[PDB]
Amino acid sequence: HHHHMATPHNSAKVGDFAETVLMCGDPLRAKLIADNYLENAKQVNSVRGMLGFTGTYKGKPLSVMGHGMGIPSISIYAEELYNVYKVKTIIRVGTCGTVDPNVHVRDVCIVTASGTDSNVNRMRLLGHDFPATANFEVVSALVESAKALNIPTQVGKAYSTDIFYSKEQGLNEALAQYHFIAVEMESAGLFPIADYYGARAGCICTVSDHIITHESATPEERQTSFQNMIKIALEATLKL
Amino acid sequence: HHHHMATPHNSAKVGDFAETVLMCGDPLRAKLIADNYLENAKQVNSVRGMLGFTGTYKGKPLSVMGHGMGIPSISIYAEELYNVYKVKTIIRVGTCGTVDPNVHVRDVCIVTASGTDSNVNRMRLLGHDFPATANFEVVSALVESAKALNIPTQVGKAYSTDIFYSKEQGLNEALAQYHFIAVEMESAGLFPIADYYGARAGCICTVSDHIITHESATPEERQTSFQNMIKIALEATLKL
Amino acid sequence: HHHHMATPHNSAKVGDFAETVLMCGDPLRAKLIADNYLENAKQVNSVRGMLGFTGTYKGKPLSVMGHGMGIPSISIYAEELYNVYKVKTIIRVGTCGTVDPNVHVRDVCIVTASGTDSNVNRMRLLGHDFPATANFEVVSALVESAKALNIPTQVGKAYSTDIFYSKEQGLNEALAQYHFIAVEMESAGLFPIADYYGARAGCICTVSDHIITHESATPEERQTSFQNMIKIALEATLKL
Amino acid sequence: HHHHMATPHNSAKVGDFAETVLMCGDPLRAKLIADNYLENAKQVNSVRGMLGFTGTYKGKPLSVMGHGMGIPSISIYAEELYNVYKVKTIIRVGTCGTVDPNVHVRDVCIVTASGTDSNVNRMRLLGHDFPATANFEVVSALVESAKALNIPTQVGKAYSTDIFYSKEQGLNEALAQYHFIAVEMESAGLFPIADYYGARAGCICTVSDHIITHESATPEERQTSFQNMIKIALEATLKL
Amino acid sequence: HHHHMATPHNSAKVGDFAETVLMCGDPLRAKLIADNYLENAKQVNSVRGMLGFTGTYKGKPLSVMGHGMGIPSISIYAEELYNVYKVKTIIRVGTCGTVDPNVHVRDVCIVTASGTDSNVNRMRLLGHDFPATANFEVVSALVESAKALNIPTQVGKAYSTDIFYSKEQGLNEALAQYHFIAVEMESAGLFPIADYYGARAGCICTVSDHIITHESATPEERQTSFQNMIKIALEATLKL
Amino acid sequence: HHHHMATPHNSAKVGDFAETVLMCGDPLRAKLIADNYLENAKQVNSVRGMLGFTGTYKGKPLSVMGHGMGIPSISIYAEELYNVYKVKTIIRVGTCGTVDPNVHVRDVCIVTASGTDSNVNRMRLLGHDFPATANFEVVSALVESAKALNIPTQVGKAYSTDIFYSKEQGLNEALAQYHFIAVEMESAGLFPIADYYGARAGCICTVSDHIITHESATPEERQTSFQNMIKIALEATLKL
């Protein structure tokens, strides 16, 4: 039985997303967030398995949805959310690697801006350097929420790469030299889309892996890190 | 209950993929392919909802798995398939748009090479132009299979973009001027990875939308197009 | 009479700069800041007329120095300050233009990150996009200081151009589309140098000119704007 | 005595070229091809010594002409052939080097697409990656002709460089990593011009030199290789 | 009968070129120069029809040889001349177009530097801007020779394009805005090669065509222009 | 007391600059030039401490003004001089480093063209290579003046970098390979601006430092070098 599609990639009806949305790469993690932290929750997207849900957190409307892997994937989903679904604030909630010697596995990283090896931002600004920059109120809400929860955080730059399986000599050394704290694949695509729509975005990630030492969080450590990060993000939404 | 992970993105054990794999963006379409065309089928990946299956087509081992949207996503999955899972041949089976006035909605397009606005291939070849090129035996198997099935095809170049929601003036005119037949988002990332591993890849797509006229296949027309394309691809695997 | 030179561009002896420095393009403005807001002040640089001073603001060590016009100029002075003079925090205090329809002449802009048409940041990060990003503690100190002073601010992205006399079609439209709030010439060169040295930087500017309407602050309006901005910056230094 | 010039570079009258043309870099080789394989042959171009001839091969109209060395040179001649002379199919017949460990001196290489260090294709596609791609019917005609003649072939990517005397570190390693089979200087300029005119092109080359081992075909070996390649190309024209 | 080849593209024996060489695109023009202006002349290259000759002009050793069309072609020939044949000075003698409103058809242009759309000079200087610059003594010898002959000249920048058949919007306007006096295809490739070898190069061209007005020199006018330019070049060689 | 400003960066009234201007980076050096070599001198600019003066040298009108450090700085000042102040000729008089083994500390270098790592010239010429080229009459006047004064000179290419504190591996080797004689920071920005206005520019510099050996001129040696260079420049102005 055919259903009307408000976008090519999302089964939700217009209005079915809250103005504030958390997004993570793995749709199964979106379901875990909804099941464990949202009330009044309903599934609003099933297309491509990219599960999305709308409910409330402490009474305030909040949605959560997967975004898939990479800049092109998050760009589709976020463009649609801001444009068709009229979302105002997206916080990406993710995992990351690090090269910074002072950032450790299990650390929580709040992203102020994200570099990239993608061409998508050059294309938006006449070939020039367009910093993918988080909204300050979002960053501050995340920082303040972690402080109130007594959870330490690292605040600074991420790097969003198109290539998970890097073969690039000298990259890690440059990222470390300039104190990039988080290596991931999506945030640099999100922030300029928020800008286009006059909207807001941020990102918070937990360090799953040290790219230099190959230290890696166990499943139990990843659950603890997730619980800390998601509580920070959820509490931050109450201020946004 | 924790399971050992052969890669960060795939629950399959080494050996659980056939040497030949069909891949499509939508994991739910991978399941439809498995359910309707594979025998001896078992689900071998569930991670991130990116369903993958292994069975046989007319007795020959064949797998099918989703790849998600965009070059970064297919690059993760294909790198792992060629490297860890020792796959020899991947055929991307997809949908596409067209700008070419002689290509029509519902047409089947067999891709010989794919352009891109991604930087991933420049990075592989010292900043130069590296054509993402299908393997000739794969292209020929697709062409010959369609001929034997009496299904007309268009053969030629695709363009793989990082940006589904294009705002780029003059792009469609240039794509049409040079007779790019298919606009999609992934094939240009697949072909160089096959090259790295000394392996093979190709792509076949059906035209869902005319980018100029906004003609668009209905659900029923998309099913008919899918049935034609998938039969071509499946028959081609018998020759590869 | 020859004097020993700790750098090719600065007559100050090692140790003659405080750990916190305000910098503005015009050295004559640096002198005005020193004369009107610093105590215990002494001139520490005269080379190239690029006046610099060290004293205290409300008892805390603080220096102020001109940086000249453009990324190459500020890069020389800031590299030397962080490297030879062991400075920990630099706040650029400047004027800017705007294209944003919601930013007005006389507004105070606090910069979170800065785009650029310079190549200097690509060169630092293997040709990729390296966002010139302000330190969050610096941004927050500026925001909080303005709040305590009851001075409204705009917070967001700047754009640092190499070309004051732009001839570039479409630039202003793109800057406005993505809500760049400030157009200036230096901040994108400062922030990556701070990163290299594990140090901190930020920027606050007042809008002197609307690039679209050609509204322009009179001398009296520029003095009032300067007084507001400099008080914000000086109070912020007490927290840094 | 002045003659009317249909183009600045070609003395042929409109209509004096067949719809199918073989082109090689060396005009003296074009004359050898005409003298040894064409009947009904006449010289149709003498300008700049760039000898061109029109006749028949096994009764079918066929021309042969030199194209000179490099992308800019072949671009002039091919643009004119497709535009003014209304040619439909050009097959470049050439020599090449190789780095691929599985490609040997004297091998025959049929080109499916060609990379390049030239900027000419970026200029055609808004700065993006435009694969210089051979027409599939041309490739297939070459492959099938070699099979019928029992001459082994290698099929795959070429690389067309602007710089015969390379000084570029890491280039050969990257070409080998991605299984580029032929290194030459022209094909990447030909294929996009064919596309512009809605026409067809391909390339077949013989390996004269191994770039790694410095193995090099003797004059006698080059004649044998030429005889094999040219027979393949000539027989392929009967199918095009 | 096989002859030893000192380079892959030139039949001349080492020592068979004078230290000073004139080069033009058309080998048939090289022969005209030799036949009409050199004494003691012998043909020293026949390979690829790229005629080259060595003799004397007013008793001083001088060679003349064709270079073909485009940067890749002249780069082969000039690299070999400077490296294997130990040439010290090359003057390119050519024809050109113009867009400059103050440059007229039949004018003689002496080139001080040449821009380009080729990538070959970026590759030599770490991706940066490397001006293809004529040697000052060569430029001055050409200027002084024309003065002594009472032949007016234009002195300034050329632009060497890879694409004779330009489709590029805005190019002519930019070339005119910045007073590029000559449009041709080779000089920007010559000057950096001279630099590599610690040698000298220059270029003098006659305007055959006005790109804006389509004014075009007749055959008789081209002969008169050639006679003026070649006399200037030949007299300049006596000073070099 | 407010004064009318003919430009945002210069207090001079229209007409207060001579048609010929010498410019150096350090405004204090501009004052030394005025005080020691100009008659009828008056200070015409004080803005930003960027001292400028107008008087006569041997009776002919001549101005001298500082330009600050880097391409963006000189671009502001030179654009204004050519556009608002109607200047016809600017000679940059500066200091430089060298890597060339045949160029020595204290040598005088006359610049024919300047490379750069800036993007400002690509932006002027559709992204292509635009050589920043000195006017030939200016170069020749400098060469002839030095000859008449019996002061040896080196003539050739400069390189204008945005980054005084280079971290770039391989740069010095490439500059030496291609015989760049002078390393500085401004000339590549000046020459294209002169071109835009149909005006003239050149540059002469003295070598203060050998970048390889770290040989460095003492204060006394810098004064002697300055005296030689400035006399050459001043005498050249009499011919321009």
Structural determination approach: X-ray
Q: Are C28 and F49 in contact (CB under 8 A)?
A: yes
**For residue C107, what is the enclosing H or E element?**
none
Q: Report d(CA C236, CA C162) in Å as an integer.
A: 29
Q: Are B92 and B24 in contact (CB under 8 A)?
A: yes
Count of H-run helices and E-run strands, chain E: 7, 10
What lies within 8 Å, CB to CB, of F116 at 6+ separation is E128, E129, F71, F132, F159, F160, F161, F162, F188, F189
Closest of B57, D62, E195 to residue F156, by C-alpha = E195
DSSP tag of D69: S
Q: Are strands D154-160 and E39-45 parallel, antiparallel or unpaired?
A: unpaired
Closest of A214, A213, A180, A187 to residue A202, by C-alpha = A187
DSSP string, D90-148: EEEEEEEEE--TT--TT-EEEEEEEEES-SHHHHHTTTSB--EE--HHHHHHHHHHHHH
Q: CA of A139: which chain C residue's CA is closest?
A: C136
**For residue F187, what is the enclosing H or E element?**
helix F187-196
Look at residue C13 and tell me if it is in a domain: no
**For residue C167, what is the enclosing H or E element?**
none
Interface check for D39 against chain E (CB to CB < 8 A): the answer is: no
Look at residue F151 and tell me if it is in a domain: yes
Q: Report d(CA F117, CA F174) in Å as an integer.
A: 13
Q: Report d(CA B179, CA B189) in Å as an integer.
A: 20
CATH value at residue F178: 3.40.50.1580
User: Residue D172 phi/psi, 5° resolution?
Assistant: -65, -35
What lies within 8 Å, CB to CB, of C185 at 6+ separation is C25, C69, C70, C71, C160, C161, C162, C164, F72
Instruction: Give the side-chain half-sphere CA count within 13 A for F88.
Output: 10
Q: Are E96 and E182 in contact (CB under 8 A)?
A: yes
Q: Are D118 and D160 in contact (CB under 8 A)?
A: yes
3-state secondary structure of E182: strand
Please list the alpha-helical segments (H only) found in C44-158: 71-83, 120-124, 136-148
Q: At which residue do the structure tokens 């003026």 appear? A: E228
User: Residue F218 phi/psi, 5° resolution?
Assistant: -70, 170
Residue F210 identity: H
Chain F CB contacts of E121 under 8 Å are 129
The neighbouring-strand residues paired with F54 are: F42, F63
Q: Is D187 exposed, middle or buried (0-12, 13-18, 19+ CB in 10 A)?
A: buried
Q: Is B113 exposed, middle or buried (0-12, 13-18, 19+ CB in 10 A)?
A: buried
Q: Are strands E132-133 and E108-116 parallel, antiparallel or unpaired?
A: antiparallel
A window 200-239, beta carbon within 8 A of B? 219
* CA angle in degrees (0–180, nearest 5) for C136-C137-C140: 85
Q: Are strands A52-57 and A132-133 parallel, antiparallel or unpaired?
A: unpaired
The neighbouring-strand residues paired with C160 are: C116, C184
Catalytic residues of F: 209
Closest of C150, C153, C158 to residue C107, by C-alpha = C153
Could you tell me which residues of A are annotated as the binding site? 9, 92, 185-186, 209
Structure-token pair, residue C206: 């007042």
Nearest-by-Cβ selection for C155 from A126, A136, A177: A136
HEC string of A34-75 equals HHHHCEEEEEEECHHHCCEEEEEECCEEEEEEECCCCHHHHH
Q: Report d(CA F50, CA C51) in Å as an integer.
A: 12
Chain A CB contacts of C114 under 8 Å are 131
Q: Report d(CA D56, CA D39) in Å as an integer.
A: 5
Chains linked to E by 3 or more Cβ pairs within 8 Å: D, F
Closest of B158, B157, B151 to residue B224, by C-alpha = B151
* CA angle in degrees (0–180, nearest 5) for E70-E72-E75: 105
For D239: left if phi > 0, alpha if psi spans -120 to 50, otherwise beta; the answer is alpha
Number of Cβ within 10 Å of residue E165's Cβ equals 14
Interface check for B121 against chain A (CB to CB < 8 A): the answer is: no
Look at residue B10 and tell me if it is in a domain: no
Size of interface B-D (CB pairs under 8 A): 110
Residue of D1, D48, D168 for testing the chain E interface, max E β-carbons within 10 Å: D48
User: Residue A29 phi/psi, 5° resolution?
Assistant: -70, -35
Q: Report d(CA C238, CA C62) in Å as an integer.
A: 9
Q: Report d(CA D87, CA D95) in Å as an integer.
A: 23
Interface check for C113 against chain A (CB to CB < 8 A): the answer is: yes
Q: Report d(CA B55, CA B39) in Å as an integer.
A: 6
Interchain touch C–F (≥3 Cβ pairs closer than 8 Å): yes
Q: Report d(CA D31, CA D24) in Å as an integer.
A: 10
Closest of B199, B154, A233, D169 to residue F169, by C-alpha = D169
Q: Is C215 exposed, middle or buried (0-12, 13-18, 19+ CB in 10 A)?
A: middle
Q: Are D109 and D154 in contact (CB under 8 A)?
A: yes
Nearest-by-Cβ selection for E112 from F112, F129, F179: F112
Q: Is B129 exposed, middle or buried (0-12, 13-18, 19+ CB in 10 A)?
A: buried
Chains linked to C by 3 or more Cβ pairs within 8 Å: A, F
Look at residue B200 and tell me if it is in a domain: yes
What lies within 8 Å, CB to CB, of D223 at 6+ separation is none
What dihedral angle (degrees, nearest 10) is formed by the CA atoms of C145, C146, C148, C150? Answer: 170
**How far is residue B78 CA from its own chain's centroid?**
11
Per-residue CA distances from D12 to B46, D44, E12 (Å): 65, 5, 32
Look at residue B217 and tell me if it is in a domain: yes
Number of Cβ within 10 Å of residue A231's Cβ equals 15
3-state secondary structure of E206: strand
Chain B CB contacts of D124 under 8 Å are 174, 177-178
Q: Which residues of F171-201 are buried (b: 16+ CB within 10 A; e: fewer)?
A: bbebbbbbbbbbbbbbbbbbbbbbbbbebbb
Q: Report d(CA E126, CA E144) in Å as an integer.
A: 36
Structure-token pair, residue B100: 């070419």
Interface check for F163 against chain C (CB to CB < 8 A): the answer is: yes
Closest of B94, B99, B103, B112 to residue B222, by C-alpha = B94
Q: Which residues of A33-66 are buried (b: 16+ CB within 10 A; e: fewer)?
A: bbeebbeebebbbebbbbbbbbbebeeebbbbbb
Chain E CB contacts of F114 under 8 Å are 131
What lies within 8 Å, CB to CB, of D226 at 6+ separation is D29, D206
Q: Report d(CA B67, CA B76) in Å as an integer.
A: 8
3-state secondary structure of A152: coil
Q: Are F123 and C117 in contact (CB under 8 A)?
A: yes
Resolution (A): 1.2
Rg value, chain D, Cα: 17
Look at residue D81 and tell me if it is in a domain: yes
Q: How many domains does chain D have?
A: 1
Residue B127 identity: G
Q: Which residues of F104-119 are buried (b: 16+ CB within 10 A; e: fewer)?
A: ebebbbbbbbbbbbbb
Q: Is B221 exposed, middle or buried (0-12, 13-18, 19+ CB in 10 A)?
A: middle
Structure-token pair, residue B48: 């991130």
Q: Report d(CA E85, CA D216) in Å as an integer.
A: 23
Number of Cβ within 10 Å of residue C106's Cβ equals 15
What lies within 8 Å, CB to CB, of C78 at 6+ separation is C23, C67, C90, C189, C190, C193, C194, C201
DSSP string, C77-97: HHHHHHHTS---EEEEEEEEE
Structure-token pair, residue F155: 């003539």
Q: Are D105 and D181 in contact (CB under 8 A)?
A: no
Closest of E187, E73, B174 to residue D71, by C-alpha = E73
Q: Is D37 exposed, middle or buried (0-12, 13-18, 19+ CB in 10 A)?
A: buried
Q: Report d(CA F130, CA E157) in Å as an integer.
A: 9
* CA angle in degrees (0–180, nearest 5) for E152-E154-E156: 155
Structure-token pair, residue A55: 């409910």
Structure-token pair, residue B208: 């869902």
- C73 and F72 within 8 Å at the Cβ level: the answer is yes
Q: Is F169 exposed, middle or buried (0-12, 13-18, 19+ CB in 10 A)?
A: exposed
Positive or negative: CA dihedral B27, B30, B32, B38:
negative
Q: Report d(CA D229, CA D223) in Å as an integer.
A: 10
Q: Are B77 and B68 in contact (CB under 8 A)?
A: yes
Q: Report d(CA B55, CA B59) in Å as an integer.
A: 9
DSSP tag of A178: T
DSSP tag of D209: E
User: Residue D222 phi/psi, 5° resolution?
Assistant: -65, -35
Q: Is D148 exposed, middle or buried (0-12, 13-18, 19+ CB in 10 A)?
A: exposed
Closest of B54, B184, B25, B190 to residue A48, by C-alpha = B25
- C50 and F48 within 8 Å at the Cβ level: the answer is no
**For residue F43, what is the enclosing H or E element?**
strand F39-45
Length of chain A: 240
Q: Report d(CA A26, CA A69) in Å as an integer.
A: 8
- The Cα of C195 is separated from the nearest Cα of chain A by a number of Å equal to 5
Which residue segment(s) compose the domain that D200 sits in? 20-237
Q: Report d(CA B80, CA B67) in Å as an integer.
A: 11
Residue D106 identity: R
- C75 and F165 within 8 Å at the Cβ level: the answer is yes
Q: Report d(CA F224, CA F226) in Å as an integer.
A: 5
Look at residue D48 and tell me if it is in a domain: yes
3-state secondary structure of B88: coil
Q: Report d(CA E213, CA F63) in Å as an integer.
A: 41
- B123 and A168 within 8 Å at the Cβ level: the answer is yes
Q: Report d(CA C139, CA C145) in Å as an integer.
A: 10
Interface check for B117 against chain D (CB to CB < 8 A): the answer is: yes
Q: Report d(CA A216, CA A210) in Å as an integer.
A: 6
Structure-token pair, residue B122: 């420049």
Length of chain E: 240
Interface check for A94 against chain B (CB to CB < 8 A): the answer is: no
Look at residue A7 and tell me if it is in a domain: no
Q: Are strands C200-210 and C89-98 parallel, antiparallel or unpaired?
A: parallel
Q: At which residue do the structure tokens 């729509």 appear? A: A197
Q: Are C99 and C56 in contact (CB under 8 A)?
A: no
Q: Report d(CA C66, CA F29) in Å as an integer.
A: 18
Question: Does B209 appear as a known binding residue?
Answer: yes
Number of Cβ within 10 Å of residue F133's Cβ equals 33
Rg value, chain A, Cα: 17
Structure-token pair, residue F96: 């430089």
What lies within 8 Å, CB to CB, of D182 at 6+ separation is D96, D97, D98, D103, D109, D111, D156, D157, D158, D159, D205, D207
Closest of A100, A134, A137 to residue A115, by C-alpha = A134
3-state secondary structure of C21: strand
- The Cα of E119 is separated from the nearest Cα of chain D by a number of Å equal to 6
Beta strands in chain C (DSSP E): 20-24, 39-45, 52-57, 60-66, 89-98, 108-116, 132-133, 154-160, 182-184, 200-210
Q: Is A121 exposed, middle or buried (0-12, 13-18, 19+ CB in 10 A)?
A: buried
Closest of A150, A63, A154, A148 to residue A107, by C-alpha = A154
